[PDB]
């Protein structure tokens, strides 16, 4: 009853048959910006079915010495579809996200994934006092790999990362995880090219293991923006 | 608070509303 | 559902429960939810009327503690033949909450904070023979980020036509004034996954809205024939606090005030590969009663 | 005028005083409040979220190997798999938890705890465990006979891959202290041990070593008081670029 | 008597405190209030009056030549005439305005601006311009293709010799800062550029070079806060005859 | 204000009346 | 502001002042009150409980021999057995009593006292005593003729093995002082003497020497005031391990 | 007591209830 799920957004749809109950982050659902919280006075564009639809990132190979993967939002979508064109032509954006993470294997495989969405994941670098530069943070669509996922690459702890909106993909139980993210900012709208607000982290807490034949197990991420507004129309940079 | 600004007041330690279910039960059903 | 909790919850008595289809102790961690198994559902309980108040773990009480944010000893003397980097009877301080790690780790338990800052300035003095301690007058002028900070003790930026100054003596009680919530956003960004400017050579992690301003502190007195070491300590108490989106606490030691870089200690505890100090085996009990 | 006299405690700066002070910016209008998701109004909301225990706090467990306990098939019955030190104040498996870090800002604590264990083997892996909580007073129980005489739960693996071991509040008075003496009568909580109830039976194509992840949260009868500084952070020098704030 | 105790902050002199103090002339009767024209009760009344931009802040523009922009007939289409740096805090064309000087006594600002351009050619001079406001994020647009994709107004010269380019408040949060970093995401406003929409066509007896005067005011949604000293005045010595006040 | 003179009082920061039209629209029509 | 002025006594620390002071732990929630048996709300509850006099405060009476008075058979009539000094302040038989120790924390006292004497011979032992209280002014009465002219009780041994000698409050004004001058008119209470009314007659198989235990309490008209330190404890050095509290 | 905590108050010297019979007459009849 909570294991089958169809997520229809736009011209996209995802069915899954081994799901958990999906996660609404902090009990919140995405909405458009109301008038008593609006700041920018020009009329926003709301390209509803053109941008509020699933976008599927490149799959990553799930291996024995995997540390973990991360994508920063909206940086992982700033060059994809009509979401990316609205990002490049406008100054302000505001959206929630519906993240669906896919990973399946056989009933002889084991492994657990912590699929966690981290708000304002300011990263740190290891064994230096120089801050992480622009190319170390803005990885784009491909995302990055965790250097030290045990501390979440910021001196904190992976053990306490369940305070953040998360699910698990335990291969014994399910093969997908779904997190519904609202707008998470101290600001109503934001400049999407210099600020990331959600980091989707996907972490091998229990590694992949089997004794049957070794197929490739990938992990696929489908991200749907939800309730996109855009202000400040200009040329594309 | 004899000051004219409302942020000048003392600490407000009487906010006993909780909602643990936005962190412990964030699921939709 | 949001409700008002003033004491911890009571316990109901329970009985033998042997019912099919009902497994309160079985849970699904894969959903992302915390276990809802009650103590009445796992073991057989009694009725306990629980009167333990929950008011000390309030976020107001957890954060409204006056904590040290700044500390400068500076030599108070005649500075006509000193270096270029010395504090010539004055100092400037770009206000942050990230220099002293007790307040830093406590504020970094949250992603967003909205609070009024209650600033307490505690000045102490030592003779740099001994002849007595002077009752010196100090000026702490609040210069916002965007204005001009002074370059001398007797510069003419200290006249403070619009900048808010406080004039206080050492023999007085400590100087106390409240700084409001001064962010251009609705909350301060404790963590900022972003870059401060539109070019790609900005600073990572430092939201410019988060910075309060500068705190320029001078000694209004002219110099005596002898020198003194004047130490100024600044204490911040957050108040009228709203907090959002709690975070994992930092386990590794801080390296810098500018970033979340991590090295860890050399061995456990709080090392990069071992946060908890080791034991012999998973079936070894360290403090076992003999 | 009004005849006054100064009391003892006049002119002191207590760091926990609660008074009104002078506004430094008169007629300042703050930024209007916006709804931000995930507001915390009491730190006992955070303490009730489950978080991973480092039960495998051993050498040769590096990083994330410390967060899982590997169980295998055994050829002897009734064998101990792991035990968990319930000492929160001293550095054990419960320190780096949400219930562990927030409680180390306090001296006294009270209320029930819940341990959750998620089995992360294959679907074909079957097994039964017994998770025993033992009240204090004796040694930690090494055999299953001795351990099951206390509070326990017997768990069958399957479609629901998790149990909760409620650790009940069983104490003399209302609170316990975070004393450095772990063996004190006002600080010792007891022991949690896990045994094979039957065995881990896997087929030949499943991995023969399966993992448990241990979680711990607090219940809603949990309480904390007497706030103190945390032992979990410290410094002996200045941080880097902290001199640049004065330049 | 009344038992009292002194708080921290007792005996300090904050320069922004708001208290009553002792009258130095008891029973003094002030001069009766007379109606004087032009009373200001809020400094946002002054900020809404338009005042001249120095768009021609270049060398060889001396004095009042800086207040006007000379446009001429062009032989190429779609050409850039001028651009205006919207950086109020740093020294640009907006600093010596009524909206510019009063805002430099403050740190934070918010609300819409209006640029007014008066054409000061002959009656026989005709022409069309396009005045483009560009939100921040990229470079300043150099071609008319790039610039007209933002907020613009197309202006025909004639019987009404002025247009208003409303620069809308398009920002993330509520306020912007007067930071010395002009390129910051919390301080940069954007760019205003002007292009020939068609051309300046004059007859042979009109002057072939015509002038624009640029004005800027603030609207009534404009706001200022966090008062600071102004960078626009300073001194390193005493003024003349200031020693004569002590003699 | 325990002083007997009315000018001894604190600053009066509650005068929110405006009239921008005496500076922005000083025309007769 | 409020015009104030400081009185004499401003900034002093009187150790008996009664004011409110700053809480060091804000929003601290104390442990809930439990019913504990035996609550004392006034120290005059304790003073009304009887406790043993050391009437045998002599050499060769070692330890608990001091708490009992040995009486024997006599061959002369009307003989004095013991007398009790009623000087509470000076070190006599009444000092180490519940009425004696609590009263030495005070300077003034008032009200009636009761002396109880329990006969602790055999069942076969018979006898009669006379317990005489004498008001002050003269010497202590040595013969029974002289002593029985005051307040007395004649006691026959038997099934009820105890009498009470009420020592009535017979004083000039309301209170008496605990002066070091025992012979003062504002401190002397009087004398209590015991005589053989008939004799102690025992048989040959009973022990020929029998014991009395003397008790003293205060009545409910008893009162104490003017609190002072007690002479019953002192120190000239530090106690052992009191330096370890600083290490 | 201008402090927000109730234990901060001055000493409560108005508790005149007694029960000497729990120490002087602790017998059951």
């Amino acid at each position: 009853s909570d294991r089958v799920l169809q997520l229809k957004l736009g011209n996209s749809a995802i069915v899954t048959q081994e799901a958990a109950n999906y996660c609404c982050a902090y009990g919140e659902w995405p909405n458009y910006l109301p008038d008593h919280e609006a700041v920018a006075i020009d009329k926003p564009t709301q390209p509803e079915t053109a941008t509020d639809r699933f976008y599927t990132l490149k799959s990553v190979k799930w291996e024995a010495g995997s540390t973990g993967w991360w994508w920063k939002l909206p940086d992982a979508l700033n060059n994809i579809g009509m979401f990316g064109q609205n990002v490049q032509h406008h100054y302000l954006y505001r959206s929630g996200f519906l993240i669906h993470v896919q990973c399946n294997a056989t009933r002889f495989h084991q492994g657990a994934l912590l699929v966690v969405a981290i708000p304002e994941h300011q990263r740190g670098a290891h064994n230096t006092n120089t801050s992480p530069g622009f190319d170390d943070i803005m990885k784009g669509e491909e995302g990055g790999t965790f250097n030290h996922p045990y501390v979440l690459d910021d001196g904190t702890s992976l053990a306490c990362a369940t305070i953040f909106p998360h699910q698990w993909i335990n291969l014994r139980t399910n093969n997908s995880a779904t997190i519904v993210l609202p707008w998470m900012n101290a600001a109503p709208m934001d400049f999407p090219l210099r600020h990331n607000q959600w980091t989707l982290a996907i972490i091998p807490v229990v590694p992949l293991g089997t004794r049957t034949m070794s197929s490739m197990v990938p992990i696929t991420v489908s991200i749907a923006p939800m309730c996109c507004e855009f202000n400040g129309l200009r040329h594309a940079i | 608070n004899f000051y004219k600004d409302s942020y000048a007041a003392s600490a407000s330690k009487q906010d006993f509303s909780q909602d643990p279910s936005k962190f412990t039960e964030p699921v939709v059903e | 559902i949001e409700s008002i909790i003033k004491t911890a919850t009571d316990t109901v008595k329970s009985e033998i429960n042997a019912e099919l289809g009902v497994v309160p102790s079985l849970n699904a961690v894969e959903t992302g939810a915390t276990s809802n198994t009650e103590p009445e559902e796992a073991i057989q309980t009694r009725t306990v009327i629980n009167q333990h108040g929950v008011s000390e773990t309030l976020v107001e009480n957890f954060l409204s503690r006056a904590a040290l944010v700044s500390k400068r000893s500076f030599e108070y003397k005649d500075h006509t033949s000193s270096a270029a980097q010395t504090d010539k009877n004055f100092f400037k301080w770009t206000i942050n909450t990230r220099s002293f790690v007790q307040l830093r780790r406590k504020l970094e338990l949250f992603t967003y904070l909205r609070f009024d800052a209650e600033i307490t300035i505690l000045t102490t003095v030592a003779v740099n023979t001994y002849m007595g301690l002077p009752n010196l007058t100090l000026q702490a002028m609040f210069v916002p980020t965007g204005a001009l900070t002074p370059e001398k003790q007797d510069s003419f930026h200290w006249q403070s036509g619009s900048n808010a100054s406080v004039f206080f003596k050492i023999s007085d009680p400590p100087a106390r004034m409240t700084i409001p919530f001064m962010c251009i956003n609705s909350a301060y960004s404790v963590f900022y996954d972003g870059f401060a400017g539109f070019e790609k050579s900005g600073l990572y992690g430092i939201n410019p809205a988060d910075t309060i301003g500068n705190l320029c502190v001078r000694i209004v007195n002219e110099h005596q024939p002898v020198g003194f070491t004047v130490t100024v300590r600044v204490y911040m108490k957050p108040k009228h606090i709203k907090a959002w989106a709690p975070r994992p606490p930092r386990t590794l030691p801080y390296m810098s005030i500018a970033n979340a870089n991590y090295k860890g200690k050399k061995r456990a505890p709080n090392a990069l590969n071992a946060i908890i100090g080791n034991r012999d085996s998973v079936k070894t009990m360290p403090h076992n009663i003999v | 005028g009004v005849p006054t006299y100064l009391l003892p405690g006049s002119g002191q700066f207590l760091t926990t005083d609660d008074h009104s002070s002078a506004p430094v910016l008169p007629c300042f209008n703050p930024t209007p409040e916006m709804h931000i998701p995930g507001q915390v109004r009491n730190m006992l909301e955070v303490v009730q979220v489950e978080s991973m225990m480092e039960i495998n706090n051993t050498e040769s467990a590096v990083g994330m190997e410390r967060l899982k306990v590997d169980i295998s098939a055994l050829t002897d019955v009734d064998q101990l798999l792991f035990n968990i030190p319930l000492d929160i104040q001293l550095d054990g498996p419960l320190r780096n938890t949400l219930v562990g870090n927030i409680s180390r800002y306090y001296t006294h604590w009270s209320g029930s705890l819940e341990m959750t264990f998620m089995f992360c083997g294959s679907f074909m892996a079957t097994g039964k465990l017994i998770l025993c909580y033992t009240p204090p007073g004796g040694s930690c129980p090494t055999t299953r006979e001795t351990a099951m005489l206390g509070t326990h739960i017997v768990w069958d693996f399957g479609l629901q891959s998790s149990v909760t071991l409620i650790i009940p509040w069983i104490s003399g008075s209302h609170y316990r202290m975070f004393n450095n003496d772990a063996k004190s009568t006002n600080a010792n909580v007891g022991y949690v041990t896990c045994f094979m109830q039957t065995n881990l039976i896997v087929p030949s194509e499943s991995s023969d070593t399966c993992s448990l992840i241990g979680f711990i949260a607090a219940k809603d009868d949990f309480s904390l008081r007497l706030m103190r500084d945390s032992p979990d952070i410290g410094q002996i020098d200045h941080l880097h670029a902290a001199e640049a704030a004065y330049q």
Side-chain angles (χ1 to χ4, degrees), chain A, chain B, chain C, chain D:
Chain A
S1 180
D2 56 351
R3 295 181 67 188
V4 291
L5 173 61
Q6 174 162 351
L7 300 165
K8 177 181 72 67
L9 278 81
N11 56 0
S12 63
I14 296 172
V15 299
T16 183
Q17 310 193 14
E18 294 185 356
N21 191 355
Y22 62 87
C23 181
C24 296
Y26 305 113
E28 295 290 327
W29 189 261
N31 55 358
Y32 290 106
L33 181 62
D35 295 336
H36 65 278
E37 292 186 354
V39 171
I41 65 165
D42 58 347
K43 186 176 180 292
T45 182
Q46 294 175 356
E48 294 182 355
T49 48
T51 59
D52 304 335
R53 65 177 303 281
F54 286 98
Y55 297 106
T56 296
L57 304 174
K58 186 179 179 182
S59 294
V60 294
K61 290 180 184 177
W62 161 247
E63 293 173 353
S66 295
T67 60
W69 295 274
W70 56 266
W71 294 265
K72 289 184 180 292
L73 292 175
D75 178 64
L77 297 177
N78 287 333
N79 208 169
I80 300 171
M82 287 303 293
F83 183 79
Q85 298 298 322
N86 277 303
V87 162
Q88 291 177 355
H89 284 273
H90 290 274
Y91 170 57
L92 297 170
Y93 90 112
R94 187 190 188 274
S95 69
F97 294 99
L98 199 156
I99 294 174
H100 191 80
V101 173
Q102 300 98 245
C103 181
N104 53 12
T106 59
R107 289 183 172 184
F108 296 98
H109 284 87
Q110 71 185 3
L113 289 169
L114 178 62
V115 177
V116 56
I118 299 169
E120 298 291 327
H121 190 265
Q122 176 177 354
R123 292 179 62 85
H126 175 259
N127 203 2
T128 186
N129 48 6
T130 304
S131 296
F134 188 80
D135 291 331
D136 295 330
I137 302 299
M138 305 298 284
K139 296 289 186 182
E141 185 270 331
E142 292 182 356
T145 301
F146 278 98
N147 292 315
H148 299 92
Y150 173 63
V151 295
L152 294 171
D153 291 335
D154 55 357
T156 59
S157 67
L158 177 61
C160 299
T162 58
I163 195 63
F164 286 153
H166 70 282
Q167 281 195 351
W168 291 89
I169 298 172
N170 194 1
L171 296 178
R172 183 182 177 90
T173 300
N174 56 354
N175 60 8
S176 68
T178 302
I179 301 168
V180 179
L181 297 174
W183 177 254
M184 194 68 208
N185 201 1
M189 302 184 78
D190 203 0
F191 181 62
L193 296 182
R194 293 295 185 270
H195 184 205
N196 293 321
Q197 301 175 2
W198 287 104
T199 297
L200 175 70
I202 293 169
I203 292 163
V205 181
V206 173
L208 180 64
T210 192
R211 290 188 293 172
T212 191
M213 62 177 287
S214 295
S215 298
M216 177 190 75
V217 183
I219 300 169
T220 308
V221 178
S222 293
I223 296 168
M226 293 184 75
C227 295
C228 292
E229 290 186 353
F230 295 95
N231 275 313
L233 180 63
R234 61 162 196 264
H235 62 280
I237 308 170
Chain B
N1 187 5
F2 290 99
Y3 301 105
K4 295 184 183 181
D5 290 325
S6 65
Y7 64 90
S10 65
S12 61
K13 295 177 183 291
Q14 293 296 110
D15 193 2
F16 289 97
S17 295
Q18 290 184 359
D19 194 1
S21 65
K22 71 173 71 175
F23 308 111
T24 61
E25 295 288 328
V27 299
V28 79
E29 293 293 329
Chain C
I1 301 169
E2 180 176 358
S3 69
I4 293 169
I5 308 295
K6 290 182 186 291
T7 59
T9 61
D10 295 332
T11 306
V12 184
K13 65 180 288 184
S14 63
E15 294 294 326
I16 294 168
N17 201 1
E19 186 180 2
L20 288 171
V22 179
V23 283
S25 297
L26 287 173
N27 291 310
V29 175
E30 295 87 358
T31 64
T34 305
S35 178
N36 51 0
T37 302
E38 293 293 328
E40 294 84 1
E41 290 171 348
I43 53 99
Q44 185 163 355
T45 59
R46 66 174 295 165
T47 298
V48 176
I49 304 300
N50 196 357
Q51 299 176 359
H52 297 170
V54 301
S55 64
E56 194 167 359
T57 61
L58 293 173
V59 180
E60 189 73 27
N61 197 10
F62 182 75
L63 287 171
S64 68
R65 296 284 188 270
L68 189 68
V69 291
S70 178
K71 184 179 182 292
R72 293 290 279 177
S73 297
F74 64 98
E75 295 291 327
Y76 170 61
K77 63 183 180 182
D78 187 73
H79 288 282
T80 63
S81 67
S82 66
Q85 295 292 321
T86 64
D87 288 331
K88 298 180 183 179
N89 311 127
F90 76 105
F91 66 94
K92 184 264 297 178
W93 176 53
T94 301
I95 298 171
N96 56 353
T97 58
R98 296 176 70 183
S99 293
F100 293 99
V101 297
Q102 285 298 120
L103 185 64
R104 186 177 183 178
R105 186 178 184 266
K106 190 186 292 296
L107 294 180
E108 288 177 350
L109 297 179
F110 299 100
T111 308
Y112 297 110
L113 291 170
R114 183 186 175 96
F115 62 94
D116 298 324
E118 177 167 353
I119 300 299
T120 306
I121 300 168
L122 179 67
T123 301
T124 206
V125 65
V127 177
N128 196 4
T129 186
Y130 179 75
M131 308 303 293
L133 292 179
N135 295 320
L136 297 176
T137 305
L138 279 78
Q139 177 182 359
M141 180 173 67
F142 177 70
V143 175
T145 303
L148 292 170
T149 61
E151 293 180 354
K152 291 179 180 180
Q153 180 190 5
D154 53 351
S155 69
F156 290 156
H157 294 92
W158 294 106
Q159 61 192 355
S160 296
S162 302
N163 289 323
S165 297
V166 60
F167 290 91
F168 62 97
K169 293 184 177 68
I170 297 175
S171 64
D172 283 335
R176 179 181 283 173
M177 71 284 197
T178 298
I179 282 174
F181 174 72
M182 285 167 57
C183 189
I184 64 173
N185 298 311
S186 294
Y188 295 116
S189 294
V190 183
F191 289 90
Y192 183 71
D193 191 7
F195 293 90
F198 290 108
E199 292 182 353
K200 292 177 177 65
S201 63
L203 294 177
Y204 180 68
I206 301 168
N207 200 2
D210 183 75
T211 304
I212 306 299
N214 292 317
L215 187 60
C216 299
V217 177
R218 62 100 172 255
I219 293 171
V220 182
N221 293 101
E222 293 178 352
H223 61 86
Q224 279 92 24
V226 304
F228 296 97
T229 300
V230 173
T231 303
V232 176
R233 285 172 178 84
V234 183
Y235 290 88
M236 188 190 78
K237 189 180 82 177
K239 62 181 182 179
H240 306 99
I241 302 161
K242 291 185 185 293
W244 293 273
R247 299 182 70 90
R250 190 186 177 97
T251 62
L252 298 182
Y254 290 99
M255 295 184 74
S256 177
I257 67 165
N259 51 24
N261 290 338
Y262 58 95
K263 182 177 172 64
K265 292 178 182 291
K266 190 181 288 185
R267 292 180 178 92
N270 295 318
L272 179 71
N273 291 317
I275 294 169
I276 284 97
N278 294 319
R279 56 176 172 170
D280 293 328
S281 65
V282 295
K283 57 184 73 173
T284 294
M285 187 58 68
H287 299 286
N288 201 1
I289 303 296
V290 297
Chain D
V2 177
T4 60
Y5 60 94
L6 296 178
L7 293 178
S10 177
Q12 73 185 4
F13 168 55
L14 183 65
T15 61
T16 58
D17 58 355
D18 197 0
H19 298 286
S20 66
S21 62
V24 77
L25 294 172
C27 293
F28 184 80
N29 297 108
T31 305
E33 296 180 354
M34 190 178 71
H35 184 270
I36 304 171
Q39 183 176 358
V40 183
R41 291 183 292 274
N42 192 341
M43 296 301 289
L44 293 177
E45 300 176 356
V46 178
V47 88
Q48 294 173 2
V49 177
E50 68 187 6
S51 60
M52 285 180 278
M53 296 182 281
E54 294 194 4
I55 305 165
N56 198 5
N57 52 358
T58 60
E59 290 179 351
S60 67
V62 177
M64 293 167 64
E65 296 172 351
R66 304 174 70 85
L67 290 174
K68 63 181 177 66
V69 175
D70 288 331
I71 64 168
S72 295
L74 297 170
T75 61
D76 293 331
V77 297
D78 312 340
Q79 294 302 109
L80 179 63
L81 299 175
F82 60 92
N83 55 12
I84 300 168
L86 289 175
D87 292 325
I88 302 170
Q89 173 60 39
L90 289 178
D91 184 76
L94 298 181
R95 181 182 62 79
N96 197 9
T97 56
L98 293 170
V99 65
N101 290 118
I102 303 301
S103 299
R104 288 166 68 90
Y105 288 100
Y106 293 93
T107 313
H108 295 173
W109 69 281
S110 178
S112 297
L113 297 172
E114 65 92 22
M115 282 185 176
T116 308
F117 290 91
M118 180 172 68
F119 178 69
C120 298
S122 65
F123 186 83
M124 292 290 109
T126 58
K128 287 172 188 285
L129 303 181
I130 181 169
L131 292 164
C132 303
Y133 166 66
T134 302
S139 66
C140 182
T142 61
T143 59
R144 195 182 70 185
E145 292 175 350
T146 301
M148 68 85 46
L149 294 174
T151 298
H152 65 272
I153 176 66
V154 181
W155 169 39
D156 181 67
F157 298 159
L159 194 147
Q160 299 293 319
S161 66
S162 300
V163 280
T164 298
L165 176 62
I166 296 292
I167 299 169
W169 184 248
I170 301 167
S171 181
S173 288
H174 298 274
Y175 290 89
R176 280 170 181 159
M177 297 179 73
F178 287 113
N179 200 2
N180 281 315
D181 195 5
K183 298 180 181 180
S184 177
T185 56
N186 293 317
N188 209 168
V189 185
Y191 306 104
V192 172
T193 59
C194 181
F195 288 83
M196 283 295 179
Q197 189 69 268
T198 61
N199 198 7
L200 181 68
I201 299 98
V202 301
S204 295
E205 289 180 353
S206 293
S207 177
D208 51 351
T209 301
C210 297
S211 294
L212 290 173
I213 298 173
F215 296 92
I216 188 161
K219 299 302 291 180
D220 51 354
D221 56 352
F222 188 80
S223 180
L224 292 165
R225 68 176 190 173
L226 214 172
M227 185 173 176
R228 66 185 174 91
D229 63 347
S230 182
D232 292 332
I233 199 70
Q235 56 184 353
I236 63 169
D237 294 332
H238 293 90
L239 301 177
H240 181 76
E243 293 175 352
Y246 299 103
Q247 297 294 320

